[PDB]
Amino acid sequence: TMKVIDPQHSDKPNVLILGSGWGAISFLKHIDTKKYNVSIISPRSYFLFTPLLPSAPVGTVDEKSIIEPIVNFALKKKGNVTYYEAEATSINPDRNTVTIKSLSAVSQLYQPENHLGLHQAEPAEIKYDYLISAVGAEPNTFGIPGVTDYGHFLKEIPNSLEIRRTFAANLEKANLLPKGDPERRRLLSIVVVGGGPTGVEAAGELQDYVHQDLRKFLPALAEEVQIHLVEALPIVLNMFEKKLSSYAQSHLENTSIKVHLRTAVAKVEEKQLLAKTKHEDGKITEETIPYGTLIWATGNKARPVITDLFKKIPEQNSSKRGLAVNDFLQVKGSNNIFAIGDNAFAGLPPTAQVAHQEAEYLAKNFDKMAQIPNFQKNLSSRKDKIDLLFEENNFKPFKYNDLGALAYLGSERAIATIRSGKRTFYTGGGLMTFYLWRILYLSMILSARSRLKVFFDWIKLAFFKRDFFKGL
Amino acid sequence: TMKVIDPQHSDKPNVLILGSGWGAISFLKHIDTKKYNVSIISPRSYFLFTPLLPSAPVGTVDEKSIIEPIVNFALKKKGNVTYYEAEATSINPDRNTVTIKSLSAVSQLYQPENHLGLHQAEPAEIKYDYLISAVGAEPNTFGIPGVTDYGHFLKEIPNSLEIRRTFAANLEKANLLPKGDPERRRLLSIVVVGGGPTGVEAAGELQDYVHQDLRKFLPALAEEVQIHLVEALPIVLNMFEKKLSSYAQSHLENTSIKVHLRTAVAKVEEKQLLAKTKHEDGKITEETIPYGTLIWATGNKARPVITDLFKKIPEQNSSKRGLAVNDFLQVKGSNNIFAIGDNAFAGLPPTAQVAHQEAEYLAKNFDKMAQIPNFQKNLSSRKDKIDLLFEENNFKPFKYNDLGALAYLGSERAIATIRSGKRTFYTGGGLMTFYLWRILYLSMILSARSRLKVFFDWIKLAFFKRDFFKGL
């Protein structure tokens, strides 16, 4: 009644990867396809270079520039790679299967090719020997009413399109109104919730667009726009040194952004929202803020496919943020499922930096398991022995190395702290820090094509105004 | 009951331009905004470099690369320019007004700025002293049933997006079917109707995508695609020398395109179409062709706003292709309306070449009228005297100079004939002709930005596969 895909052409173990983001793609880049048969399930046919997503809505870079098709990474592999463009809806640990839905395409990047007899929008289950879970996390509204109906997350490419569309629409409407109309002022106002680096960069890029481009042809309109950054803690960018946070805040304010600290959004309606400030003395004030565009850049929560898995594994029943993993990124209470990135919790921060390091670590471990015959044998064995097998063969546990953090602030200023272990190599803000920010992000891009395209976008930006088309 | 916009701040004449394509933008580039007050009505906020439109659906170039916002041309003008993003629905010659609808935005690129009190989706009429009509022409189905419902024109940016979407969707579906399934073969088949340069280049670019890119990751899928070029005349590209047409046809066939000459599409259904061949002996055969993607690249017809104007002007009642104009591009039976490009008929071909030459000619005439006080006086005068006034002051009539024609054929071959007057400088086909085709098109681009972007797209193409995203 339910189609099952179980490739037994080879005696290479079937490694199944969920997702096409930081964990999945970094893992894919390092996994040995000569030793393993690799399959990928993800509803998104491309990798997204998340740190430049805030630059996309106003066209500092193009949406296409920061994405790279999964297929292009896969063509570089020596062995067999299969990509299922579908969503994993259920992880079935006791039968070693993943259920998929919303199937759109299957791509078998090998020329023998076995017809699988799948049809679009028909469920199927995919058999694995090893599961690597990297489906990431979804934006968290914290139960605040209205944010889903009236705000825009900043998490995926379509969010960037939506934001451009809303804001460009607001600008056209607003410019038809007479100066000093409160409705005009509402349309020209943007609220960015979340004073983490995502919200800060979003606010900064928007301000860049308004000041550098919009101002060239509608200066009076540009003058009236008001961007708000709303943050619940007493400082923005709290992962940085306090003095860098103050530098950032003063800079943002200097570019005309209004920063609301100690402030939380309580309720969102279609044209206004309620913000409460909890002052240091303890008193609580409240302000209703009319807004044209709301961008919700706070926090992530676990995905339904992952929370369901919490129930199916006893050791995992007490999980909340993500799957709990051991020293070897093995999901607790499972001997063949691994979890990396934001869908896993190990006490580390939910960043690309961690996801990328975990992926590379895990792929190296898979190199070693391929030299030890017993691993692939415990697959068929009755006993979950893979936990023991890591300590037995003295695999080192995963150790995260924090390399620091960066944040663009708009108007050619950035802050940065670069490190390794206990050594700090760079830490500060300014004009040169901005150039460093560019060179560094360019270096972290996972593909030559995307790297060139971003580079071409920045060159073009030196001579011309950003592309800000309503429907492109 | 109907708002009327009549700027009388200055004693500069109000020149009103309809459209934002080849005629409108070329004219705008050359019109003297120190002598004239310039306004523009067009539903499309940008100029479209039409000759590269066939390269967009498969990402040989990107859609953004071949467009340039009207506003960027306008910023370069010294005087006052206003852009109404709306559709001209009625030209009202006796009151010197144009009715607009579907208003989205108004942009006054000048600092004084008078609030006009317009609202979105409220009709208005725009007063002019001089009207320049350049709304172009729309695609012509020839009454063939089904082409509107089931095909895609190749006329505007959204057509390019639609075609990519259809064909990318068909490829995913087809690759899920087993080899030799007729439904798979149907999904992999494309029909391009029209053997003019538009249809040829569309066919050529698609074949390029299939052979150079698709083949790299789904070679068997690439092998099964079949592109058809359907043309009713006995030769393709009939504006060229017969020998260049034969070269082109053999080339297309050599790249695996199937060329159907003396063949017309009689009827289009959702999954097949009826094609009839009228052989040279006189006999008529018919073939039903299953297709996944239909591209309709034949012919244009006059727009409704233009046909309505036919009825309102006596001298224009017998018009069919477009507005009839005199030696000075003045609309016959009107003393203040001019028509250039495809909305005008003067016995010249409907090309960008003609539209661009007319525009530049007309803007130079407007330079001369600005030295002769009587022109701007006949505006207020009771008598239509502007017709006489051109012969009187010995303005030379517009003379078109054919510079030739180019066509890309796919697989790095093109044909080209370059001329001026009776002299031919170049005429032939081949690899070098392709490089010439690139250098020449780059030269005809109207903006530095668009020119750089196209150039970057071609560079990227030298190293990487085309971007072919379903939803970007």
Ligand SMILES: Cc1cc2nc3c(=O)[nH]c(=O)nc-3n(C[C@H](O)[C@H](O)[C@H](O)COP(=O)(O)OP(=O)(O)OC[C@H]3O[C@@H](n4cnc5c(N)ncnc54)[C@H](O)[C@@H]3O)c2cc1C
């Ligand atoms: C705008 C923005 C900027 C950021 N900037 C930085 C930065 O500068 N530095 C930094 O360290 N971190 C940054 N991050 C955070 C970083 O992107 C994440 O920590 C990282 O993406 C986590 O990697 P992941 O693979 O776990 O999830 P992701 O990278 O998000 O990838 C998850 C993938 O799984 C796929 N998927 C989703 N649901 C399913 C399903 N049901 N089945 C199968 N597949 C599924 C998705 O399509 C996605 O491709 C940023 C995040 C955002 C939103």
Ligand SMILES: Cc1cc2nc3c(=O)[nH]c(=O)nc-3n(C[C@H](O)[C@H](O)[C@H](O)COP(=O)(O)OP(=O)(O)OC[C@H]3O[C@@H](n4cnc5c(N)ncnc54)[C@H](O)[C@@H]3O)c2cc1C
């Ligand atoms: C795919 C393609 C490729 C081509 N390649 C070539 C080539 O290589 N060489 C060549 O010489 N010619 C070429 N042409 C022909 C050339 O593009 C046209 O002749 C060109 O458009 C000149 O016509 P125009 O400027 O009058 O109108 P267009 O350039 O078509 O533009 C007319 C403008 O009027 C606007 N408009 C439409 N309706 C209304 C309304 N109701 N009110 C107000 N404004 C309106 C439109 O938005 C548009 O911006 C090509 C055409 C196509 C479709």
Ligand SMILES: NC(=O)C1=CN([C@@H]2O[C@H](COP(=O)(O)OP(=O)(O)OC[C@H]3O[C@@H](n4cnc5c(N)ncnc54)[C@H](O)[C@@H]3O)[C@@H](O)[C@H]2O)C=CC1
């Ligand atoms: N350039 C860089 O180095 C970047 C790094 N990152 C990392 O990616 C991860 C993703 O996190 P982010 O999206 O940036 O979120 P974040 O969690 O770092 O910040 C969200 C912020 O919004 C605030 N907030 C929560 N609820 C609120 C409410 N109801 N009303 C008002 N404010 C509220 C919180 O105090 C919080 O600090 C982070 O861990 C971050 O460190 C993200 C972007 C850029």
Ligand SMILES: NC(=O)C1=CN([C@@H]2O[C@H](COP(=O)(O)OP(=O)(O)OC[C@H]3O[C@@H](n4cnc5c(N)ncnc54)[C@H](O)[C@@H]3O)[C@@H](O)[C@H]2O)C=CC1
């Ligand atoms: N690179 C270049 O020089 C380019 C120039 N152009 C211009 O675009 C303009 C469009 O002019 P058109 O009059 O439309 O010529 P067209 O050449 O686009 O004509 C379309 C062709 O399809 C044929 N056809 C018509 N009905 C058919 C049917 N029902 N079934 C099958 N075939 C059918 C016609 O005979 C005709 O040859 C041309 O003047 C052309 O020069 C367009 C693209 C490129």
Ligand SMILES: [Mg+2]
């Ligand atoms: Mg196997």
Ligand SMILES: [Mg+2]
């Ligand atoms: Mg991932």
Ligand SMILES: [Mg+2]
């Ligand atoms: Mg990602």
Ligand SMILES: [Mg+2]
């Ligand atoms: Mg995530």
Ligand SMILES: [Mg+2]
């Ligand atoms: Mg994850």
Ligand SMILES: [Mg+2]
């Ligand atoms: Mg025009």
Ligand SMILES: [Mg+2]
């Ligand atoms: Mg055009």
Ligand SMILES: [Mg+2]
């Ligand atoms: Mg100016």
Ligand SMILES: [Mg+2]
């Ligand atoms: Mg036209």
Ligand SMILES: [Mg+2]
């Ligand atoms: Mg016209």
Ligand SMILES: [Mg+2]
């Ligand atoms: Mg179809």
